[PDB]
Amino acid sequence: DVNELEIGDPIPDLSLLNEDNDSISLKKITENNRVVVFFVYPRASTPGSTRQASGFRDNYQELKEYAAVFGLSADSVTSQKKFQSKQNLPYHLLSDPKREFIGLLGAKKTPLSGSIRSHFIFVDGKLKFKRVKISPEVSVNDAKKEVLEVAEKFKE
């Protein structure tokens, strides 16, 4: 869209529903956690999305000492909940059917429909890593490297 986020831009002051149908404020997540990872997948419960979500699950015990982690897609709350429960995800999945946040992050597939596998890391409420169109493996591996990089910078 016209208002696409770039490095240094604040997180959009929007709220999205998690898999339990509870509203999560994007600003409040980034206020409570120095680092937040949003990973975007096209559709819940597909081989591609399962690979990405499961790698974040497998990294979660480690990452949760650095960052909050959220999955994000255009799926309904009920689709997100089925995905979360089947895959035993320890982090939340956010529903964005209008691709409002997905849009601003730069991850729409076409103006009309769909999302592109991506991830986005915010530090102190501002966009720090912007990874659009990557594989499930690259998303999982690079998100961890990037999170660890920014945590290192805090030591000064």
Cα 96 to the chain's mean position, in Å? Answer: 11
Please count the helices (runs of H) and the strands (runs of E) in the chain.
5, 7
Per DSSP, helices labelled H in 1-156 are: 26-32, 47-63, 77-87, 100-105, 136-153
Does the residue 2 lie in any domain?
Answer: no
Does the residue 4 lie in any domain?
Answer: no
C-alpha distance from residue 37 to each of 78, 110, 123, 130 (Å):
22, 23, 9, 10
Return all residues near 120 (Cβ < 8 A) that are at least 6 apart: 37, 38, 39, 40, 105, 127, 129, 130, 131
Does the residue 112 lie in any domain?
Answer: yes
Give resolution in angstroms. 1.8
Closest residue by Cα to residue 50 from 17, 79, 87, 13: 87
Cα 8 to the chain's mean position, in Å? Answer: 17
Q: How many domains does the chain have?
A: 1
What approach was used to elucidate this structure? Answer: X-ray
The Cα 141–Cα 14 span in angstroms is: 28
3-state secondary structure 50-83: HHHHHHHHHHHHHHCCCCEEEEEECCCHHHHHHH
Does the residue 147 lie in any domain?
Answer: yes
Domain that holds residue 114: 9-156
CATH of residue 71's domain is: 3.40.30.10
Does the residue 84 lie in any domain?
Answer: yes
Pair 90, 57: CB distance under 8 Å: yes
